[PDB]
Paper text:
[name] produces a GH29A α-fucosidase, [name], that is ~104-fold more active on α(1-6)-fucosyl linkages compared to other linkages. This enzyme is particularly relevant because α(1-6) linkages form the basis of human core fucosylation, which significantly impacts the function of glycoproteins such as antibodies. Our results suggest that [name] employs a conserved hydrolytic mechanism with a specific subsite that accommodates GlcNAc in α(1,6)-linkages, while [name] tranfucosidase mutants work by shifting equilibrium between open and closed conformations of an active-site loop.
To better understand the catalytic mechanism of AlfCWT and its point mutants, we solved the X-ray crystal structure of AlfCWT into which we soaked l-fucose. In these crystals, fucose produced no substantial conformational changes, with a CαRMSD = 0.14 Å between the fucose-bound and -unbound structures. Specifically, H18, H87, and Y131 coordinate O4 of fucose; E39 and W40 coordinate O3; W40 and H88 coordinate O2; and nucleophile D200 interacts with O1. W283 and W198 contribute to a hydrophobic pocket that accommodates C6. However, there is no structural evidence to support this assignment in any fucosidase, and Oδ of this residue in [name] is ~9 Å from the nucleophile Oγ, with no plausible access to the reactive C1 of fucose. Its location on an α-helix with very low B-factors suggests it is unlikely to unfold to move closer to C1 of fucose, while its hydrogen bond with O3 makes it far more likely to be involved in fucose binding rather than catalysis. In [name], Oδ of this residue is ~12 Å from the nucleophile Oγ, with W198 separating the two residues.
Residue numbers in the entry:
A (entry chain A), D (entry chain A): 2 to 247, 265 to 345
B (entry chain C), C (entry chain C): 2 to 247, 267 to 345
Write the structure that this text describes.
């Protein structure tokens, strides 16, 4: 494997949230999203017809995988993880199985995952994928319809507005037709995938969890899978803020905490609550000392840019880090 | 022209800055614009080739002149003034004379000035136009090339990067071919224009100032022109805040400002004047017989920023509350 | 006790956090408190010797109970609830039982609770008290030493730095000697208390919960007590926002919140809820028959922060506007 | 002199604004000061009776000249300049001539200038003084009463509210009785003064300008005086933002631009518009390349602390600077 050895010593990674949600940028008809701008479709129950039409305005002229990967490399990040497809159900790659994707639906007409995969290969960074394997707001039988007992960063976990008939929904339809095929797609194209990032099942069955584990193993034998997929089908445990030293057995000794620079994963115009360089550097050092990789999220803006203050704070966090390691 | 009487009593107006600059939103290649985001092309000397290409990404799905004018009406604004064409040289209307415009250059493929003109006619709001009659960064002979002695919200007043040869530039070429024709266009289409908003000439000759005055008078006899055009060719003086006490023959005055510190949308500028600040300034200007022209900088999807809307509406509630007492 | 009828229809109340924590204002030796600035002594384990010395610098020249209650009245708040004594153990009234209080320890040399109680009586506002009946960081046997299993807005629930010997601490000593006497003090002086606001017991026994209930009932028979004290010793349930839909026999409910993210004043916390957010939340809570208890964290000079005042007043104007429609 | 040689190569200095204005912290009776919080007494025409009473609440428990000078030293600042007395007329040293001072008027009962002077001597930093030699809002005949033709960061340049009789004011009374004696005081006590920082005369006569120049020369022969005092009585020209490369002859080749981290010189609770580390570092490098010392102001808070974000941004600016000089 020795992908295991590399992950123990990686320490630092860039995460990217980017999708149709990025264009709305935390705002819908003069009202604010929750802290999570990427959840805006659920928050305002925006009809798929309307939300999907955002694709017609997706033309990020300043997107540049080379420049993004370079920034990651300059901050000493050793891997990059991207949203291939979030809860909204929109793919950021050229999906054969669903035309609801950046390549087919947008004037941009380009494979974002492909460009990042290539930028990473040439730069010598490992490449990881995020995929929402349970929630899909574009799919009539998207997940979450049997677990609205608990509150969300939107309204409901499922698209309950376009598809209200909760007692006639069947996730198997969504899983077989979109979910598994799309996982096969991202895991076969775009070369070696170092890390695989799934959500916690609400809907997805035990069988269906095992299936995704097998699929990834067969197509990407070196790919490290994160705890979220399901118990006993992972190679590193993803820890939440509430789980970090001042429980899920991890047999390989591999741990990763994800966070954002501000309070949103997706870009949000109103969210300027950027963690200071010192906060970023200190948290990284704290996580690293406990043998935990820091996966730090950038939410790209409508033109596909790292926000100015996100870049500034990553670079100043790097200078504080280097200064401290010289002492 | 009872337009004079109406302006004395108007008290409040919406101004709109919107253009290609709105898409960059105060940011270029990881660096910040000045307080003035609309000046970003000059600030970073962005080649016309590149800046112009922003047009290919201009698709403001949420633009809605009816909803914008409704907001203006609800805040008790009696007129609306829009950027037809700013220093960058990009027209926000269907220009016959230049294809560098929202209708021809953008997937949106719609006349912004036309939609606002109509929304205003139906809502019963007077309609005013802003036009950069001197500065044009898209025109080889754009203005400002004989007055870089003074600092700007960008680098230079003219496009000195695409068109460096300052000693072979001739503003007459730009004026005759783009400026005057475009003024004729905006003043003839889009119905009655109540207010005309020009910049202070740096380059534009005395003759050329008189020409624009005549053109507006002949096409829009009721249209009130602002002091900026040149001395003795105006009907109201536009005041800066630093010029109100404690040279206008009609007794008509107007101070323009923005809610934050930028005229164009700027995602880094969240320094919104509070409702109380907005309401108090309006009351101060009105008591001195000065119309408050308050700018909204629409975002890439053609939306009034959430906090701009909130603060206009809360300023209105403070104002109404105070008039009930 | 028509106090029940009055609380069902009260709808809106001011809450006040104020203490030694207010002087540090979210900051200690170049580092930030948590969202809760009032928790700063626990957050940085500041020795009582040092923290207590803040009392020597407590001289809020601009404190004015009349002006504070007037603001509350102008926003249509019908009651006011104050911190008599928070987790830090410092009394904001002239306590016979402990000299660790605003009157005895500070150059200000005045009873804050007394001035507010009087300002409220004269203004026609009901007066409520908050008291930390379990946690006391100044008391060797302060509460929380048997429940550090769970994380806090500081470090530990108890003062574990000045008083580390957890296995030789006895809350009974603190309860008998400081807690019950101080409750007797605040409930006997300062006239009628409409609302009594306690914390959730971590340490405090079943007996000790019943005792406080009895004490309040005997001294203040009209006083409505909140659920936090313990099950079956309350007259209204204090709800968290996450517990309102889409266990109270009198039908009385109250949700408390702050304008920014801190209860105590925090100079770094400028995340003020907009007027619209405040007005809408109030309307939402009121429609569900829930009183909105909205916290102000007074600053070192005893002032309502400028933006807290602005946003309460603008929230009031939005509310009045909406009721006129 | 070779104080001249040292100033050419100093590059960086800390400035401190601190006074009664610091306690109000940009706010008076629910209304905001201008960008300049230190100007608040003029802005709201606060009677001397009331403003002066702030002295009774001045007890900055966390003031620590050693820690302040240490921070300055860690950022590579080579000198420290303090407000001995600002426009409000309140001395921050033990003045024999006026009891309106930190030592006599406040429960703190300590000489701030003295503690900083000592902290600097022991740390090996040069020590400089600011003094408002024209404006004094506490003095009946304070300056500015013949130049209200122009707007200010308050209302008027002079105290025109406590002392309205403009046509019966005489600056000579103020100059002879308070100004010159206080300059003699600060220049004789607190040891060697490296830099002397005066305001531009509005009121102060040509004679009176020459007098202050002579006084400083006789008491502090090595002390470099800044252009503001008056034409031909200075050793370095202080440049404003509008005067810095993309005029006052400077014969020694010595230049200094002062600025603050946020938009206020005095502490202001509402002013969180902190210049980012990159902005601070870049400006410093720009000024230094043009042979201009950067004098960067900290506005101490009511407890005598460097604001958390001021400290963080100075330290991160230092790390960016060191990183860039390694390359
Ligand atoms: C990283 C975060 O994990 C959560 O489960 C998601 O709901 C958020 O949108 C985000 O992707
Ligand atoms: C309203 C403002 O007037 C100024 O002169 C212009 O330069 C700005 O860009 C803006 O249009
Ligand atoms: C109102 C809030 O209730 C909580 O329980 C307390 O811990 C906070 O400090 C604050 O008093
Ligand atoms: C450094 C600044 O210089 C100006 O002249 C003063 O008016 C300000 O208060 C501040 O001291």
């Amino acid at each position: 494997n020795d992908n295991v050895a590399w992950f123990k010593q990686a320490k630092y990674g860039m995460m990217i949230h980017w999708g149709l949600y990025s264009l709305l940028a935390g705002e819908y008809r003069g009202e604010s999203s929750s802290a999570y701008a990427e959840w805006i479709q659920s928050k305002f129950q925006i009809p798929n017809a309307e939300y999907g039409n955002l694709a017609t305005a997706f033309n990020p002229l300043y997107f540049d995988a080379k420049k993004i990967v370079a920034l990651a490399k300059q901050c000493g990040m050793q891997y990059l993880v991207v949203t291939t497809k979030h809860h909204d159900g929109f793919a950021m790659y050229h999906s054969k199985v669903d035309a609801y994707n950046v390549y087919d639906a947008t004037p941009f007409h380009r494979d974002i995952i492909g460009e990042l995969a290539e930028a990473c290969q040439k730069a010598g960074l490992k490449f990881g994928l995020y995929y929402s394997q349970d929630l899909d707001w574009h799919d009539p039988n998207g997940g979450g319809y049997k677990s609205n007992d608990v509150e969300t960063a939107g309204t409901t976990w499922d698209n309950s507005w376009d598809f209200p008939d909760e007692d006639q929904k069947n996730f198997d339809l969504c899983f077989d037709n979109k979910i598994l095929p799309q996982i096969k797609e991202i895991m076969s194209n775009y070369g070696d995938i170092a890390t695989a990032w799934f959500d916690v099942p609400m809907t997805l069955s035990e069988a269906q969890s095992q299936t995704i584990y097998d699929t990834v193993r067969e197509l990407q034998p070196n790919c490290l899978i994160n705890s979220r997929l399901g118990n006993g089908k992972y190679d590193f445990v993803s820890l939440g803020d509430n789980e970090i030293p001042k429980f899920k057995p991890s047999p390989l000794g591999l741990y990763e905490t994800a966070g954002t620079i501000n309070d949103s994963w997706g870009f949000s115009y109103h969210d300027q609550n950027w963690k200071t360089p010192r906060t970023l550097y200190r948290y990284k050092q704290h996580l690293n000392d406990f043998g935990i990789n820091y996966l730090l999220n950038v939410g790209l803006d409508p033109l596909g840019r790292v926000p100015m203050m996100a870049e500034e704070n990553l670079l100043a966090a790097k200078a504080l880090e280097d200064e401290a390691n010289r002492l």
